[PDB]
Amino acid sequence: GRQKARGAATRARQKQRASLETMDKAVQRFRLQNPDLDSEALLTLPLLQLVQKLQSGELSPEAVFFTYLGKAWEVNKGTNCVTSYLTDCETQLSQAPRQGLLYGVPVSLKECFSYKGHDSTLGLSLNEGMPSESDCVVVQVLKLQGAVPFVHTNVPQSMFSYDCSNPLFGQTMNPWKSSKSPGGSSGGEGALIGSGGSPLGLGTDIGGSIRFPSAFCGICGLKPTGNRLSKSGLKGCVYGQTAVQLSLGPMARDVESLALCLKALLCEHLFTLDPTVPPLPFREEVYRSSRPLRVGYYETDNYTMPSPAMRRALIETKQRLEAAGHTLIPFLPNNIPYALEVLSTGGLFSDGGRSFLQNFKGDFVDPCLGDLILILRLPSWFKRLLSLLLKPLFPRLAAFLNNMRPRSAEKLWKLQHEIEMYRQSVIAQWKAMNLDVLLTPMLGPALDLNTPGRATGAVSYTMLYNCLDFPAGVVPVTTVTAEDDAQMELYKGYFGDIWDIILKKAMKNSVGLPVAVQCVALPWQEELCLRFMREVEQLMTPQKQP
Amino acid sequence: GRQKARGAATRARQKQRASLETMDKAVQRFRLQNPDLDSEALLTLPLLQLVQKLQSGELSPEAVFFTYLGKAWEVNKGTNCVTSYLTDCETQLSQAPRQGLLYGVPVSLKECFSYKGHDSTLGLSLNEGMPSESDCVVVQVLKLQGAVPFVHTNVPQSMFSYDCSNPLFGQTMNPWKSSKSPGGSSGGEGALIGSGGSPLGLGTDIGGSIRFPSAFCGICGLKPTGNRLSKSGLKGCVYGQTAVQLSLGPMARDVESLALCLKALLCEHLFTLDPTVPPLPFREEVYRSSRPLRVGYYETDNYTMPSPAMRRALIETKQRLEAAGHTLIPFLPNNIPYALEVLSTGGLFSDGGRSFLQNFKGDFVDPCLGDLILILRLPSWFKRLLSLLLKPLFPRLAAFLNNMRPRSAEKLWKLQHEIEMYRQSVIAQWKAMNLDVLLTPMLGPALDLNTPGRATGAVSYTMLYNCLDFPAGVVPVTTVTAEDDAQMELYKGYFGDIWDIILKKAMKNSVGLPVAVQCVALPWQEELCLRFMREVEQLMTPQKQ
Ligand SMILES: O=C(CCCCCCc1ccccc1)c1nnc(-c2ccccn2)o1
Ligand SMILES: O=C(CCCCCCc1ccccc1)c1nnc(-c2ccccn2)o1
Ligand SMILES: CCCCCCCCCCCCO
Ligand SMILES: [Cl-]
Ligand SMILES: [Cl-]
Ligand SMILES: [Cl-]
Ligand SMILES: [F-]
Ligand SMILES: [F-]
């Protein structure tokens, strides 16, 4: 019953292997012609400096491209983050618009960004051997801005996961520690950028998928408001689900790179190619503002107990912000359990998971997905019964289960209205404290491979802002200390259910791993969100190369 | 029983009566203090000039307010367009922010715009005696811009109608001809502005409700992209339906008034009050552009046969645009029947009408709603049965019935995806022809009272653009001639079903009534849409500029 799936995996692995061999050949050829090039100097240039040298002609696009291609090939050896080499990029390299804001910049793409002539498998057998007819809109815009998309990077099967394995290309590993997850679903991006193999990448995010891998791999990422950028041509598993919007956004080694990428994407090219996106230009004056901020903050969401490292990261950032003249205001969005258990879960699974499950018919189920598939497949009556039985002992598990049941269109309208009202509730709460931005913990350090799928509760920090559709980004601010790690041994969680128990084991042995915080602003305020992220970066990593 | 509904109607009529009496008292008081004021001259000033004189101090806010209030009271006698006088407006009058872009401008509000202390009944007994506890966001913004919202205007019961009667406040009449509908659901606004009793109003639109009353009453109206303006605080019958977007927008005597209103609303106040609205400022340079346009056009949607007056309006406008140097290109959105019958109907009635019907429990059903409520109440299995029977001879009726059935969330996702793909498909057509804007017929002339409810097919010209969620506005360009009207005797419709039969009769006896065209641009291009409307208005009715 898996002959088709086995065939798909065999071919996918052949293509991946052939891609990597092609990259290696091209790199060797370039190095042989350019033996004196200082590759290390080039790779360590911050993106903004790299862009400046490309624009001035101090570095050639060829030098930058083949040097990054070599590094990407090398870091892939230990991470398995690359699924495909975007072959025609060497021609794009030659024709990159000279005055483009990203002229000559190699860019990595999550596998779901459609690219002409390439599959977007999402790790699913049913999508193998179905090459895209054309580049998606954001890829078109990247190219019009002179960038050179060069690889597709790995995702967990279906993308519905914050780990990163599928049965076609296998498992992506965290470059900091091979036993750890790079996070997900933009996990290949996190591993590649996090190890220096790409200066800039695009990911997508519906429950944290830009923010998890950025945090786990020690890089920066921004999830804009859902409709700030075009989703035209993004390959997905479920279509027409609009209660919880998908978002796409940049990942990079610093905040300034995110801002440049957003600025480059928010151009007339994008707005003309996809008229459904509001034509809101990047407001430079907001991004570059240096006014003191009113910063809401919380040390915990009272849902996922923060690791000791997460809490310390949050408190230290709060303290540095206060020392820098900002006003820090205790603030926690109301009714988080509702937002997660009813609104988010219900929005994602209004149909009981039937549409999602069609993708898995005849396919293997990657171990990183845990019991998700088995649970979604349960009859609605059984989900309900099991929920009732679990409720007295494990209310959180019971709540998720009950809200993953199929329902009528009538009930979906009701849910959609509740989502709208909840958004207005939190906005009103925010305005009552006159906040500018909000600082929150971000899940970390990286969990062991194959554990995100058994720690669903831990999406609480990120998924809240998908439900609310507020821009949210993450910035690395510290690393796990011996003390942080020792204190983790005493971690209990608020619920004591299997999700709390797994998280504790999954974060074992994390000394030295990166830990982030999350920065949030109101809908459409990506510029202000990035301004705040820049502040955090300046205060918590003061030696970060300009 | 009906004692609940009767009681609500009694109370509503008493409140309306008391409002009008309060207006009368205020107007007479003011007039006695200002016997020399040239009220006719004030009432006939185009809004832009009225605003200039208010801003300079040449006209006082009081003179403008009470003069319009008097006109509104007078025109209401023959139209019954006013449901409530927004009593506290005389206090807003004295506190209007002096540098506001609408300083001193009286503004009328469709009844669904929540206004503190007043009902938004929607003509439904269940909402009577339930006053709003805060102004809706756009009303707050109007006030912050110095405008003076002064009346709530009538809507058809539930607003799901392009006529304008409900059992609480009764029936609104077209000011051009008392036997005619003023259109709807923003019909009170249409009648009030159309008769000179307000220089600017706000309406809402999910299947044409800004555009029908504007066209039927001979005024201008714009339905923006759904999320260009804040819908916070708008009272409705159904919530959480997002497949077919609700929009709100201005209605006024000329295009410049719509542009001023949009410019005033699209300000920091709005964007801060409702962060969910993208903070897109009004792009003055786009609105003011005089560059030649590539204008797609169609003279019929092949779904609703246009009236002779509609077709002449379209052709004459096309010809004037050509003479003015614009490029006119035939264009028709693909699969219109699918967009209307499957996507629009399905989106509006995904739950079989159950949520909507709850509003009518224990209430009279206004005759202007025709058989809608009777039909919606039928069991899904029966809607399906009747659909099969009707299909051979009357495919249009069968299709509507079939697509008004309840369905699962799974099916609604599928439908929502189809709406997204359809929107991109029309965008792709538009781009392939390199269009700037699109010119279409607009339903007209006004239908006889109580007929819109029995001519559902005729929403085709407008509903398409709610489905697509493109900005669309209407501009009056001509009036029905006796020649046009006599030609209605040759009108057959494309289907010959009951909707065509009703529409034929309903559009007769319309000599002298206004007829519009519709102007469309891509999502978020309200300024371009307005630039085009301004062009049409200038070419067809130069005296308005
Ligand atoms: O689905 C996800 C992320 C899932 C993150 C974990 C959710 C875990 C969870 C949440 C609620 C209930 C149960 C499990 C996703 N990330 N990216 C995409 C995506 C989808 C379509 C096109 C492009 N990207 O989808
Ligand atoms: O419902 C409508 C207009 C309905 C116009 C006639 C539709 C006729 C039709 C269409 C498709 C199938 C059956 C009948 C409406 N107009 N304004 C509103 C409205 C709704 C909520 C808040 C504010 N305004 O709603
Ligand atoms: C739905 C927004 C408009 C509501 C108009 C009627 C308000 C009655 C009082 C409501 C108080 C808050 O629930
Ligand atoms: Cl491929
Ligand atoms: Cl939007
Ligand atoms: Cl009928
Ligand atoms: F996600
Ligand atoms: F409407």
What does the block give as tokens for B245? 């977007």
Closest CA in chain A for residue B434: A272
3-class state of residue B98 by DSSP? coil
Question: Which tokens in the block code for residue B529?
Answer: 């849409």
Domain boundaries along the sequence of chain A:
1-546
Amino acid at residue number B184: G
Q: Which of B19, B120, B185, B307 is catalytic?
A: B185
Tokens of A347: 């929005």
How far is it, in rounded angstroms, from Cα B500 to Cα B515? 19
DSSP B109: E
B123 is in an annotated binding site: no
Round to whole Å and give the CA distance between B361 and B46.
45
- Contact criterion met (CB below 8 Å) for A204 and A110: yes
Mark yes or no for CB contact B409/A414 under 8 Å. Answer: no
Unique residue bearing structure tokens 């189920």? A365
- H-assigned helices in A218-353: 255-265, 268-273, 284-287, 308-323, 336-338, 345-348
Query: A213 phi and psi, to 5 degrees?
Result: -70, -30
Helix (H, G, I), strand (E, B) or coil at A107: strand
Is B59:B104 a contact under the CB 8 Å cutoff? yes
Which helix (H) or strand (E) segment holds residue A152: the answer is strand A148-153
**One-letter amino acid for residue B257 of the chain:** S
C-alpha triplet A93, A95, A96: angle, nearest 5° = 70
C-alpha triplet A83, A88, A91: angle, nearest 5°: 145
Interchain pair B413, A351: CB under 8 A? yes
Tokens at residue A476, please?
């690395």
**Among the listed residues A222, A331, A226, A333, the one whose alpha carbon sits nearest the alpha carbon of residue A287:** A222
Ion ligand 8: residues, CB within 5 A, are B 205-209
DSSP tally for chain A: helices H, then strands E: 23, 13
Between CA A370 and CA A331 the distance in angstroms is: 34
Residues 6+ apart with CB under 8 A from B259: B282, B287, B527, B530, B534
Pairing of strands B514-520, B472-479: antiparallel
Which candidate, B302, B132, B87, places its Cα nearest to that of B233? B132
Return the sign of the alpha-carbon dihedral for residues B107, B111, B113, B115: positive
Closest CA to A397 of A513, A496, A528, A301: A496
A417 contacts B412? CB cut-off 8 A: no
Let me know: does A163 contact A365? Beta carbons within 8 Å. no
B246 C-beta closer than 6 A to ligand 2? yes
Q: Which residue of A has its CA nearest to B409?
A: A409
β pairing state of B247-252 and B294-297:
unpaired
The length of chain B, given as a count of residues? 545
A188 is in an annotated binding site: no
Of B232, B416, B424, the CB nearest to A242: B416
- Measuring from each residue's beta carbon to the nearest atom of ligand 1, which residues come in under 6 Å? A 112, 159-162, 185, 204, 206-209, 234, 236, 246, 344-345, 348, 400, 456, 459
> Which numeric CATH code is attached to A1-546?
3.90.1300.10
Cβ atoms A386, A378 nearer than 8 A? yes
Question: In angstroms, rounded to a whole number, what is the distance separating the alpha carbons of residues A172 and A446?
Answer: 13
A141 Cβ partners below 8 Å, 6+ apart? A230, A264, A265, A267, A269, A270, A273
Inter-CA distances, B416 with A239, A406, A472, B248, B334, Å: 8, 17, 26, 22, 18
Which of A196, A222, A162 lies closest to A460, judged by CA?
A162
Q: How far apart are the first and last CA of chain B?
A: 55
CA pair distance A462, A523, nearest whole angstrom: 15
Whether cis (ω within 30° of 0) applies to the bond prior to B330 is no
Q: In Å, how far are B190, B307, B460, B514 from B446, measured between CA atoms? A: 11, 11, 15, 8
Name the strand (E) or helix (H) holding A217.
helix A211-217
- The total of other beta-carbon atoms located within 10 Å of residue A137's CB is 23
String of DSSP letters for B267-328: SHHHHHH-TTS------HHHHH-----EEEE-S--SSSPPPHHHHHHHHHHHHHHHHTTPEE
- Taking the C-alpha atoms of residue B203 and residue A7, their distance in angstroms, rounded to an integer, is 59
Question: What would the 3-class secondary structure string for A384-441 be?
Answer: HHHHHHHCCCCHHHHHHHHCCCECEHHHHHHHHHHHHHHHHHHHHHHHHCCCCEEEEE
Residue A107's DSSP bridge partners are A149
B204 lines ligand 2 (CB under 6 A): yes
Sign (positive or negative) of CA dihedral B477, B480, B483, B488: positive
Amino acid at A455: A
Distance of CA B401 to the CA centre of its chain: 25
B110 in active site: yes
Report the DSSP beta bridge partners of residue B177: B174
Between chains, do B406 and A411 touch, taking CB under 8 Å as contact?
no
User: How many angstroms separate the CA atoms of B111 and B149, rounded?
Assistant: 12
Does the beta carbon of B464 lie inside 6 Å of ligand 2? no
Ligand 3 pocket, mutate which of B110, B115, B132 (most atoms under 8 A from CB): B132
| Of the candidates B250, B164, B156, B256, the residue with the CA atom closest to the CA atom of residue B211 | B250
Question: Ligand 8 centroid vs B443 CA: distance in angstroms?
Answer: 13
Between CA A94 and CA B481 the distance in angstroms is: 65
Strand spans (E) along B161-233:
165-166, 170-171, 200-205, 220-223
* Alpha helices in A101-169, H assignment, sequence order: 137-144
| CA distance linking residue A480 with residue B135, whole number of Å | 51
Q: Where is A110: in which H helix or E strand? A: strand A106-110
Resolution in A: 1.8
CA distance linking residue A78 with residue B440, whole number of Å: 61
Long-range contacts of B532-536 (CB under 8 A, 24+ apart): B532/B293, B532/B295, B532/B436, B532/B437, B532/B439, B533/B220, B533/B222, B533/B255, B533/B258, B533/B473, B533/B475, B534/B255, B534/B256, B534/B259, B534/B287, B535/B293, B535/B321, B535/B324, B535/B326, B536/B317, B536/B321, B536/B439, B536/B475, B536/B477
Determine whether the interchain pair A241/B423 forms a contact, defined as Cβ–Cβ distance below 8 Å. no
Tell me the C-alpha distance between A276 and B207, whole Å: 20
Q: Taking CB atoms and an 8 Å cutoff, what residues of chain B touch A406?
A: 408-410
- Counting every residue, how long is chain A? 546
Mutating to test ligand 3, I would choose from B133, B237, B246 the residue with most ligand atoms within 8 A of its C-beta, which is B133
DSSP result, B341-400: IIIIHHHHTTBTTHHHHHTTTT----GGGTTHHHHHTS-HHHHHHHHHHHTTT-HHHHHH
Cβ proximity of B322 and B293 under 8 Å: no
Q: Which helix (H) or strand (E) holds B437?
A: strand B437-441
Edge-to-edge strand ranges of the sheet holding B327-330: B82-85, B148-153, B106-110, B200-205, B247-252, B220-223, B472-479, B514-520, B437-441, B294-297, B327-330
Ligand 2: does its nearest atom lie under 6 Å from the Cβ of B376? Answer: no
A133 Cβ partners below 8 Å, 6+ apart?
Answer: A116
Q: From the alpha carbon of A160, which atom of ligand 1 is closest?
A: 1
The rounded distance, in Å, linking the Cα atoms of B299 and A394 is 64
Question: B275, A413: Cβ pair inside 8 Å?
Answer: no
Contact list, B409 vs chain A (CB under 8 Å): 350-351, 406-409, 411-412
If we measure between CA atoms, which residue out of B228, B233, B232 comes closest to residue B278? B228
Helix, strand or coil, per DSSP, at residue B331: coil
Q: What is the DSSP letter of A221?
A: E
Residue A38 CA from chain centroid, whole number: 32
Nearest to A101 by CA among A230, A269, A227: A269
Three-class DSSP category at A19: helix
Query: Which ligand 1 atom sits closest to the C-alpha of A340?
Result: 11
How many C-beta atoms lie closer than 10 Å to residue B20's C-beta? 19
Closest CA to B183 of B220, B216, B222: B216
Min Cα distance A480 → chain B (Å) is 37
Nearest-CA residue for atom 13 of ligand 3: B133
3-state DSSP assignment of residue A91: helix
Nearest-neighbour CA in chain A from B272: distance (Å) = 9
Contact between B187 and B155 under an 8 Å Cβ cutoff? The reply is: yes
Find out if CATH 3.40.50.2300 is the number for domain B1-545: no
Select from B412, B422, B520 the residue whose CB has the most chain A CBs within 10 Å, as the one to mutate to test that interface: B412
Q: What angle do CA B103, B105, B106 make, to 5 degrees?
A: 140
Query: Inter-chain contact B408–A408, Cβ cutoff 8 Å?
Result: yes
State the Cα–Cα distance between residues A359 and B207, nearest whole angstrom.
36
Residue A60 has phi, psi (to 5 degrees) of -85, 150
End-to-end C-alpha distance for chain A, whole angstroms: 55
Q: Which helix (H) or strand (E) holds A11?
A: helix A3-33
Q: A481 with A309: CB under 8 angstroms?
A: yes
Distance CA B156, CA B147 (A): 26
Of B436, B444, B244, B459, which is closest to residue B336 (Cα–Cα)? Answer: B459
Q: Is A222 helix (H, G, I), strand (E, B) or coil?
A: strand
Distance CA B107, CA B93 (A): 11
CA distance A216 to A212: 6
Greatest distance between any 2 Cα atoms in chain A: 70
Pairing of strands A170-171, A165-166: antiparallel
* Helix axes of B409-432 and A409-432: crossing angle, nearest 10 degrees: 80
- Test A410 with B280 for CB contact under 8 angstroms: no
CA gap A101, A51 in Å, rounded: 8
Which residue's structure tokens are 């009951």?
B498
- Backbone φ and ψ for A221, nearest 5 degrees, come out as -150, 150
Side chain identity at B513, as an amino acid letter? L
The burial of A62, by beta-carbon neighbours within 10 Å (0-12 exposed, 13-18 middle, 19 or more buried), is given as middle
C-alpha B324 – ligand 6 centre gap (Å): 43
Q: Is A512 annotated as a binding residue?
A: no
Instruction: Tell me how far apart the alpha carbons of residues A34 and A28 are, in angstroms, rounded to a whole number.
Output: 10
Nearest CA to ligand 3 atom 7: B132
The alpha carbon of B395 and the centre of ligand 8 are apart by a number of angstroms equal to 24
Distance from CA of B74 to the nearest CA of A (A): 41
- The runs of H, that is alpha helices, within B220-267 are 255-265
Confirm whether residue B208 is marked as ligand binding: yes
> Under a CB-based contact definition with an 8 Å cutoff, are residues A347 and A320 in contact?
no
B119 CB burial (10 A radius; 0-12, 13-18, 19+): buried
Q: Tell me which chain B residues have a C-beta less than 8 angstroms from the C-beta of A418.
A: 240
Q: CA–CA separation, A413 vs A409, rounded Å? A: 6
Which helix (H) or strand (E) covers residue A476, if one does? Answer: strand A472-479
Residues of B in contact with A275 (CB under 8 A): 427, 522-525
Q: Are B155 and B122 within 8 A, CB to CB? A: yes
**What 8-state DSSP symbol labels residue B184?**
S
Q: How far apart are CA A307 and CA A517, in angstroms?
A: 12
- Whole-angstrom Cα distance, residue A47 to residue A252? 9
Active site (annotated) includes residue B209: yes
User: What beta strand segments (E) does B154-255 contain?
Assistant: 165-166, 170-171, 200-205, 220-223, 247-252
**Which residue among B232, B275, B278 places its CB closest to the CB of A280?**
B278
The enclosing H or E element of A328 equals strand A327-330
Closest by Cα among B386, B357, B373, B393 to B500:
B393
A355–B242 CB contact, under 8 Å: no
Radius of gyration of chain B (CA): 22
Distance CA B191, CA B176 (A): 9
